[PDB]
From a paper:
Within this cluster, we showed that a GH31_u1 protein from Lactococcus lactis (LlGH31_u1) and its fungal homolog demonstrated hydrolytic activities against nigerose [α-D-Glcp-(1→3)-D-Glc]. The kcat/Km values of LlGH31_u1 against kojibiose and maltose were 13% and 2.1% of that against nigerose, indicating that LlGH31_u1 has a higher specificity to the α-1,3 linkage of nigerose than other characterized GH31 enzymes, including eukaryotic enzymes. Furthermore, the three-dimensional structures of LlGH31_u1 determined using X-ray crystallography and cryogenic electron microscopy revealed that LlGH31_u1 forms a hexamer and has a C-terminal domain comprising four α-helices, suggesting that it contributes to hexamerization. Finally, crystal structures in complex with nigerooligosaccharides and kojibiose along with mutational analysis revealed the active site residues involved in substrate recognition in this enzyme. This study reports the first structure of a bacterial GH31 α-1,3-glucosidase and provides new insight into the substrate specificity of GH31 enzymes and the physiological functions of bacterial and fungal GH31_u1 members.
WT LlGH31_u1 was crystallized in two different crystal forms (named, crystal forms 1 and 2, see Experimental procedures). Crystal forms 1 and 2 belong to the space groups P21 and P6322, respectively, and comprise six and one molecule of LlGH31_u1, respectively, in an asymmetric unit. The P21 and P6322 structures of unliganded WT (named WT_P21 and WT_P6322, respectively) were determined at 1.75- and 1.85-Å resolutions. Despite the space group difference, hexamer formation could be generated via the symmetry operations in the P6322 space group, and the hexamer assembly is isomorphous with six monomers in WT_P21. With molecular assembly in the crystal structures, LlGH31_u1 probably forms a hexamer. Interactions between insertions in the A-domain and a β-sheet of the N-domain from an adjacent protomer as well as the C-terminal α-helix domain contribute to hexamer formation. The electron densities of two distinct rotamers of Ser455 are observed in some monomers of WT_P21 and ligand–complex structures, including D394A-Nig3. One rotamer does not interact with the ligand, but others form hydrogen bonds with the 2-OH of Glc+1 and 4-OH of Glc+2.
Author numbering:
A (entry chain A): 7 to 739
B (entry chain B): 12 to 132
């Protein structure tokens, strides 16, 4: 059969597939046979036919779409024979791709891990570029129909040219169509996780879980780190106790009972797995694995780690994990730090995440793993696990940027160790700022090193820090409805929960100049504080870009007239999070109560414009509509759910059942936030002279005209104090 | 008896803790001294072998040395030491650097003001 889809062009030894007007597959084959199989990266090349034009001559071909000219001059792919011009003017002369060459503009993607990183590390390129094109090489192995490694591609060069311009959201959508959508997360993954590299007993671990309840901190996940298994008692002839599959019965004399007690507390349970030293002769499962793999047990022959080997994988899932799953382990923390070597040339991290994520689905519907990034397409195996960050202001300052930038390669479920993993320095404010970021990150998992000094328990800290941490951990559970809805949107529509500003505001230069600022779902904009407070102000700060429109602090209702770039100041207990006029945010009214789905939703409405919110749940869709001051709630299915409505400052309706409409036009649109209260608070906490406090309070109270209030603060000899006062006068204008 | 051949490789267990590893395309292995090596006469030692169709394992009191056949690559030739001095730096891979080397020396201190890099010992 000579039949070919109309989107396929062949010329010399190349094949071009025009998958969209802005996405061209580029293949080279010595043999004239081109690759149809799935690869590690690509799952789907079925794209609806698109319009394009060809200029084919003897010696050259040009493929022309709405956004790109692709040229091929025959022969081997070199920087001279294969190149493209984009039909954009985002740069004066960075509008040409050359095969095998780097161009500027790439907005970056992510990397394997933050292991041993103190602050910034280099990132790999993503598919997003300010100049409108990027090339995603497919260097992976081909897969069989059922998803096992098949060997080398017959397309010895296989590339994807993205030429979406600054339509970043559409580039990511089409990347997901190509590599497969992110699977749905389960709701439990979006709550708080407790983890610590600490040799807990059953007793001490349950006592901690019960103290979390006593302290009014909700948790969804109980992580148990490597001290669950034998460590120091492993005979040295076998190597270290890092890898283990055998319970420490001194700490866990009845593992199934312990896991059942965590299940009764509605916690999902994961164990640390260090797979690299395989199954050695001292292990509980060794007799059964040695039988299956026909090992020499009198010579203590180990079942060495080999995820290329179908029999090893089968032994690993059925005979090593299987018994631990039967005891009640819900999902696996794959903790691989042992390199990228295999006989197949496939990264063992890729093999682990691919096969473990598939195996997890027998255990539970929409199950997860926790593992490091395994390259483009590995978003199919959530969750991401960033690993052994250094505990530092510099590490925190990198992390929001790292997180939002990862959306540029579709890896949208990074779980960082909140408060940082190891080394570095103690600073309770650092631990608190890091938790603020974690709550507004894809996953909020508390974790720490083996130190006796790095517990992330709120009560480790003083009464102020402890209370603020408890408040933020409660907030995480309030946000689960919003997070779970955004999760179902990632899985169904290919939209990241965390977006860089330039996704919404691609033509605004300031959207590229606030590296740690992001959109958090569709209704909230976050600007985490990631530097130690100024002790004179007793407040930290971040420069915020406010896009055009009216914005409100999500917590205080402090207003801000966009478009402006404004330095904003917050006490260590407060975080900069903002909503536009018209925003509607659902909150669980009962974040401490372990309900499978919330019995009551708070609808938090920001007055001053129309808005809309769709709450996706396991078995329902709930639409909130705010049009000409009328707030309406409707659902796909009937339910007993109670709805609370908070319109700006004020609870209007409490615990109303069913679908309803309510006219909010006759209700107070204004937040209580006011200039005079906020000014008094900022002056009162500041470690400045009382004479300065007195004069600033007197003059700003006395001076009526806003421009002369600003002139007065402009004379202040403390420059950061001027900025803080300016923020208040700007919100109060 | 201290000598084992497998595929295109020759292993010589000189001590319980010292193993020569040779590759030869032709199956001819080198007996002559080199600039570095002057003597390969060492007393017999005890060690075990697990030889299969496609793989060999040599086991001493201190090391597992594995060879999976073919040219020597990081994947085909590697070893686990029977020690627990590190949590996961106990594996040698052919042609890869691992941590822990306490260093050796270098040709000269010509033009060196303070420290210079040393070669591995
Ligand atoms: O299992 C011990 C490890 O050091 C873990 O605590 C880290 O989180 C792994 O990255």
């Amino acid at each position: 059969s000579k039949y070919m889809n109309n989107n396929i062009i062949k010329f010399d030894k190349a094949r071009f597939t025009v998958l969209t007007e802005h996405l061209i597959r580029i293949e080279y084959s010595e043999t004239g046979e081109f690759e149809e199989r799935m690869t590690q990266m690509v799952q789907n090349r079925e794209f609806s036919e698109v319009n394009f034009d060809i200029i084919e001559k003897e010696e050259t071909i040009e493929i022309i779409t709405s956004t790109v000219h692709l040229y091929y001059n025959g022969g081997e792919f070199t920087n001279a024979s294969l190149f493209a011009d984009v039909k954009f003017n985002f740069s004066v002369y960075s509008n040409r791709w050359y095969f095998g060459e780097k161009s500027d503009g790439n907005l970056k993607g992510t990397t394997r891990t933050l292991d041993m990183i103190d602050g910034e590390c280099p990132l790999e390129d993503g598919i997003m570029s300010k100049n409108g094109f990027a090339v995603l090489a497919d260097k992976g192995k081909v897969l069989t129909e059922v998803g096992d490694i098949a060997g080398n591609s017959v397309s010895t060069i296989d590339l994807y040219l993205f030429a979406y311009g600054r339509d970043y959201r559409q580039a990511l959508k089409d990347f997901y169509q190509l590599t497969g959508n992110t699977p749905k997360l389960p709701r439990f993954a979006l709550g708080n996780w407790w983890s610590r590299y600490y040799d807990y007993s059953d007793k001490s671990y349950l006592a901690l879980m019960d103290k979390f309840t006593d302290k009014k901190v909700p948790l969804s996940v109980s992580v148990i780190d490597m001290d669950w298994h034998k460590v120091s008692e492993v005979p040295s002839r076998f190597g270290s106790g890092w890898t283990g599959y055998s319970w420490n019965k001194k700490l866990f004399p009845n593992p199934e009972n312990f896991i059942d007690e965590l299940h009764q507390r509605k916690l999902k349970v994961t164990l640390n797995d260090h797979p690299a030293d395989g199954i050695r002769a001292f292990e509980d499962p060794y007799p059964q694995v040695a039988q299956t793999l026909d090992l020499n047990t009198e010579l203590e022959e180990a079942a060495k780690f080999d995820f290329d080997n179908l029999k090893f994988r089968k032994a690993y899932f059925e005979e090593v994990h299987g018994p631990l799953e039967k005891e009640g382990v819900d999902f696996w923390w794959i903790d691989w730090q042992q390199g990228a070597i295999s006989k197949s040339g496939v990264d063992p991290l890729w093999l682990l995440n691919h096969y473990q994520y598939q195996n997890a689905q027998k255990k539970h519907k929409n199950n997860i793993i926790l593992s490091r990034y395994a390259g483009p397409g590995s978003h199919r195996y959530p969750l991401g696990f960033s690993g052994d960050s250094v505990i530092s202001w510099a590490s925190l300052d990198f992390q929001p940027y790292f997180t939002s930038t990862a959306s540029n390669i579709g890896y949208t479920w990074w779980s960082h160790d909140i408060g940082g993993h190891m080394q570095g320095y103690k600073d309770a404010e650092l631990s608190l700022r890091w938790l603020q970021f974690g709550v507004f990150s894809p996953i909020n998992r508390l974790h720490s090193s083996k130190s006796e000094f790095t517990s992330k328990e709120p009560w480790h800290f003083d009464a102020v820090i402890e209370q603020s941490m408890i408040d933020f951990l409660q907030l995480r559970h309030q946000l689960i409805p919003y997070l779970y809805s955004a999760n179902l949107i990632t899985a169904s529509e290919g939209r990241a929960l965390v977006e860089p500003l330039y996704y919404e505001y691609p033509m605004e230069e300031e959207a590229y100049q606030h590296r740690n600022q992001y959109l958090f779902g569709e209704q909230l904009m976050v600007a985490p504080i990631t530097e130690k407070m100024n002790s004179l102000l007793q407040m930290g700060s971040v420069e915020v870009w406010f896009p055009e429109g009216t914005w409100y602090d999500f917590f205080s209702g402090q207003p801000y007239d966009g478009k402006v770039s404004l330095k904003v100041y917050r006490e260590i207990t407060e975080m900069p999070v903002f909503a536009k006029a018209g925003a509607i945010i659902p909150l669980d009214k009962n974040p401490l109560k372990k309900e499978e789905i919330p019995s009551e939703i708070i609808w938090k409405i920001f007055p001053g414009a129309d808005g809309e919110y769709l709450l996706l749940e396991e078995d329902n869709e709930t639409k909130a509509e705010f049009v000409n001051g009328i707030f309406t709630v409707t659902s796909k299915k009937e339910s007993s759910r109670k709805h609370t409505i908070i319109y700006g400052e004020h609870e209007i309706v409490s615990a109303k059942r069913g679908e309803f409409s309510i006219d909010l036009n006759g209700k107070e649109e204004n937040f209580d936030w006011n200039f005079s209260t906020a000014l008094f608070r900022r002056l009162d906490i500041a470690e400045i002279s009382y004479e300065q406090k007195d004069e600033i309070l007197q003059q700003l109270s006395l001076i009526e005209e806003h421009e002369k209030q600003v002139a007065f603060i402009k004379t202040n000899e403390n420059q950061e104090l001027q900025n803080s006062l300016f923020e208040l006068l700007y919100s109060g204008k």
